[PDB]
Amino acid sequence: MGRTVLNESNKGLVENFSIPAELHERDGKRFASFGTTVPIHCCTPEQVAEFANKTHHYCDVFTEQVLAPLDELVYVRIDENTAEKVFINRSKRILLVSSDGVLAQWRSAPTFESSNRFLAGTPIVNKDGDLVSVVTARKGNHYAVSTFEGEGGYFETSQPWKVLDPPEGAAVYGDRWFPSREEVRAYTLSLPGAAVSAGSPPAPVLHRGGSGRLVLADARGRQLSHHYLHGVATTDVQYL
Amino acid sequence: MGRTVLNESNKGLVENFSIPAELHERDGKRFASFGTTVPIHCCTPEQVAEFANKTHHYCDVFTEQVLAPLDELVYVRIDENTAEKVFINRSKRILLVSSDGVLAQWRSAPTFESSNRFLAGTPIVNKDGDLVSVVTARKGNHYAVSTFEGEGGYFETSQPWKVLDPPEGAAVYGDRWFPSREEVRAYTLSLPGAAVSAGSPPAPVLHRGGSGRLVLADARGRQLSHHYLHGVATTDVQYL
Ligand SMILES: Nc1nc(=O)c2ncn([C@@H]3O[C@H](CO)[C@@H](O)[C@H]3OP(=O)(O)OC[C@H]3O[C@@H](n4cnc5c(N)ncnc54)[C@H](O)[C@@H]3OP(=O)(O)O)c2[nH]1
Ligand SMILES: Nc1nc(=O)c2ncn([C@@H]3O[C@H](CO)[C@@H](O)[C@H]3OP(=O)(O)OC[C@H]3O[C@@H](n4cnc5c(N)ncnc54)[C@H](O)[C@@H]3OP(=O)(O)O)c2[nH]1
């Protein structure tokens, strides 16, 4: 079955629309590809290392080619012969993160709402069938469309992400969090000057919550960058 | 003359509203203060060094007090006995930057539209007269309201900001810009790994333009962070 969706019966605006795709199963993971194009989180460390150098940089997407711009509506592949028509929502955003050993990418991505359960890697195309993005992560019924558009960036480091959930109202610093802001400064006094080298590269950190945060820290927990996220969902983001 | 505005005749919705302020003149520059609270860019390097430790961290604002939240309307001081009522616009945004020798702050700030020409430092208050912010920068008729609200962050470094204006469509990396993505890759290969120490702290870089960018770089221009700005104006931001 060349079906890129888990549920047996289709849901939503379905239309006849052939979009090629390839299916893979490794251990218990099942994912889809679009030629060379795969989600970064669906690759073995061997696959990640070989693709890091030959790829364009989209969050959690490996691809040897530039993706088409987004516009107002896209089609998501259901079968070899059918696809789902969905509006792109630039007001409901999801935060993506990824690492390929070279760049720790992040993106405040737009979404579309489907009640289907698409495989990671499912192709997303425009009216002309040009690949605009690939299914990566989902929060509820909202799937993240990783693209150039929207707020985004990347950290130059080999280190993977640290994904943390600080308690509500805590004063975040580095990979740590503290109950009071004064204690933050106390901990600030005890640390040395920030140190980065080839030996000890920086550490990317994502703090999920109501006050979401993107932080870059050195090996010792000293902060290099701190970024207050707004308008983006961070909690319960599932990588399919 | 206790006027916090340059133009001789008031414009806009003027209301009776007494707001304390002090006027200062250094060289040919004239700005206002609110007790301790002043704009960072209005300070001598000696004044900056003294306030860095005694301050709360708002972009281009020094203050010994926590700022009141941003409601929907604010009042801006014209003279000792009158002030202007202006609507706060969260959809037309301006990018702010500042440095105090400890934090290189940036902020996507909301704006208000006045035809008055306010001094830097003019107090901005809510209905209760609580200090909500201070006049810092403006683009055209749109003044930036520096607050906690909105997207923002800071870099830990002593270095000042580096402000560049790359040509349209160029591929930005670090402090340089290149014609295509390919040249960035070539330039990437010739560089060592980023090096940061107490001796060589990071460099904050702002790239203004259509695709505005926030970058953290080592002393030699190797990139540590890269951030694609969206939804904020960067080009004609004037620090009053
Ligand atoms: N600056 C800022 N921008 C925001 O958008 C924001 N949204 C919420 N809050 C919270 O309001 C309370 C007021 O402090 C804090 O609890 C704060 O949450 P937090 O963000 O968790 O706190 C970390 C402290 O820690 C501060 N530091 C970070 N680095 C340093 C440093 N090298 N030296 C001294 N202080 C440092 C950091 O600026 C800060 O303290 P200050 O605001 O007083 O400056 C914000 N604070
Ligand atoms: N990734 C990305 N996100 C965006 O939001 C975006 N908006 C516009 N563009 C431009 O589209 C063309 C696509 O290439 C580029 O001209 C690009 O302009 P730029 O974004 O201004 O140039 C930086 C190049 O340079 C890349 N690099 C950055 N650091 C490295 C590094 N260590 N090693 C290899 N490449 C690095 C950076 O990823 C990139 O190259 P990629 O094509 O691979 O994305 C974007 N690119």
Numbering used by the authors:
A (entry chain B), B (entry chain A): 1 to 240
What does the primary publication say about this deposited structure?
Poxviruses are large DNA viruses which replicate exclusively in the cytosol, and encode poxvirus immune nucleases (poxins) to degrade 2′3′-cGAMP and prevent STING activation.
The new poxin structures trap a post-reaction state following 2′3′-cGAMP cleavage and allow direct comparison with the catalytic mechanism of VACV poxin. Further, the T. ni poxin protein shows substitution of the VACV lysine for an arginine residue, whereas the lysine is conserved in PrGV poxin. Analysis of the host T. ni poxin structure confirms a relationship with protease enzymes and demonstrates strong homology with proteases derived from (+)ssRNA viruses. A nearly identical pocket is conserved on the surface of the T. ni poxin protease-like domain, in which the poxin C-terminus is also coordinated by histidine and aspartic acid residues.
